[PDB]
Amino acid sequence: GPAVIASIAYMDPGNFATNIEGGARYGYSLLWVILAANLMAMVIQNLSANLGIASGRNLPELIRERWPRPLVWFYWIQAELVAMATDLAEFLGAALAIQLLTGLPMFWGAVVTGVVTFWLLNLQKRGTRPLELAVGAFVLMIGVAYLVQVVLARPDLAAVGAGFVPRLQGPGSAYLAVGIIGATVMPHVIYLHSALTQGRIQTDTTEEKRRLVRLNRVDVIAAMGLAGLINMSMLAVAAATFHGKNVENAGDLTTAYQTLTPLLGPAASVLFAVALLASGLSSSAVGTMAGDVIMQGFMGFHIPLWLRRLITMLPAFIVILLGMDPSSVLILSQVILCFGVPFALVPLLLFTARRDVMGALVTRRSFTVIGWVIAVIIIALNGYLLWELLGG
């Protein structure tokens, strides 16, 4: 359940934008970022899931009930900015895929995306589970296509091997590496994963809590391992397809279908846009629902779901009216998301290390140290990037 609701967020249009642009512009040199961020997500999402299992509350709820009111207010504001940056990539990714399929302008693609998302808001298991199993099938099959294409493309193994050595090539590579981290370590899922596993116990016992931790850990790592293989394959295929060939608009999502042309042939254009649309519509609905859970946990109240859906569409329509490139703003949103990670990490690392919160399920001291090292690494990368974007 939670590991699957997770996995669909790790294959949103934000991942497509950063993987294709990462491989086309920098070859295989950013393969280590995908591997590092995926292993970071395994640790962080396991802690978030263990927080809801052990304590019975989600991370926003614990912040609201334990921290001072002004700090809860600041944490709610930054979490809403994370929610809008999350939905900005997924809503535009669906509107872009509409243009790839029908040829409509981006504004009309967003109007269609707006009507669909409002319609998708009103639903239930009688209608969601088919639509959710469908979007899961299209996105996973395309993921398998990249797993197959990465072998058929015959990538330069000397360049692939060197790509797993941590190496940054100027500020442009740091900008895209931070976007890859934000697209994999998503703060909105950090808050959401605790709510997905709360209230799932059956006998209210430590032994029952330990099992759900053991079960969730296997489901998360297996799902994260599959998502990591696909993202590495998609970047490696994008490198074998565009890197060094000096193709115009290489790395853009409008020509990303050419990565699967030697495999899918003429159908690569439709099958990629259908996957991009299904990935965008499902994740944008999931993010909207998680945004209401985050607000309810921080503030105790919420705004109507139609108003939240209306407010988050404003940055999408503004970007389209400005004529900005969709693939560029999808990557920018993932970069902003990476700046929301350390804010989500600090309460997670603190709450999961307390006995009055976790009970007998206190996080092992080694994994708490590993989590703080992950927080310092991300803070250093986000400070290094900010340093490059200001001046010397």
Ligand SMILES: CCCCCCCC/C=C\CCCCCCCC(=O)OC[C@H](O)CO
């Ligand atoms: C997307 C995340 C990227 C990282 C973004 C980090 C910066 C956060 C941005 C704005 C915070 C500004 C809002 C200031 C917080 C107001 C809280 C406050 O002081 O209000 C007092 C309270 O109302 C009395 O109880």
Ligand SMILES: CCCCCCCC/C=C\CCCCCCCC(=O)OC[C@H](O)CO
């Ligand atoms: C995706 C990142 C933003 C890009 C959007 C650009 C176009 C919209 C302009 C500003 C939106 C910022 C307003 C949202 C502020 C956080 C939500 C909030 O809670 O409002 C704080 C208020 O002060 C509570 O009292």
Ligand SMILES: CCCCCCCC/C=C\CCCCCCCC(=O)OC[C@H](O)CO
């Ligand atoms: C059997 C179930 C039916 C499967 C139906 C779904 C798969 C789509 C199949 C063919 C689409 C062919 C139409 C596009 C023709 C290819 C043209 C091309 O070369 O690429 C696209 C073009 O470049 C863009 O600008």
Ligand SMILES: CCCCCCCC/C=C\CCCCCCCC(=O)OC[C@H](O)CO
């Ligand atoms: C400034 C950012 C945008 C904010 C500006 C708002 C835009 C409102 C436009 C159309 C209303 C949509 C129709 C909604 C119909 C309301 C139905 C209703 O009365 O119930 C909901 C009520 O608000 C509680 O339950």
Ligand SMILES: CCCCCCCC/C=C\CCCCCCCC(=O)OC[C@H](O)CO
């Ligand atoms: C770059 C640094 C990344 C390092 C990559 C390491 C790979 C480990 C990944 C997942 C293990 C699962 C996370 C285990 C942490 C939570 C388990 C735990 O601590 O559980 C304690 C409690 O007692 C429960 O019963």
Ligand SMILES: [Cl-]
């Ligand atoms: Cl090369």
Ligand code: NA
């Ligand atoms: Na574009």
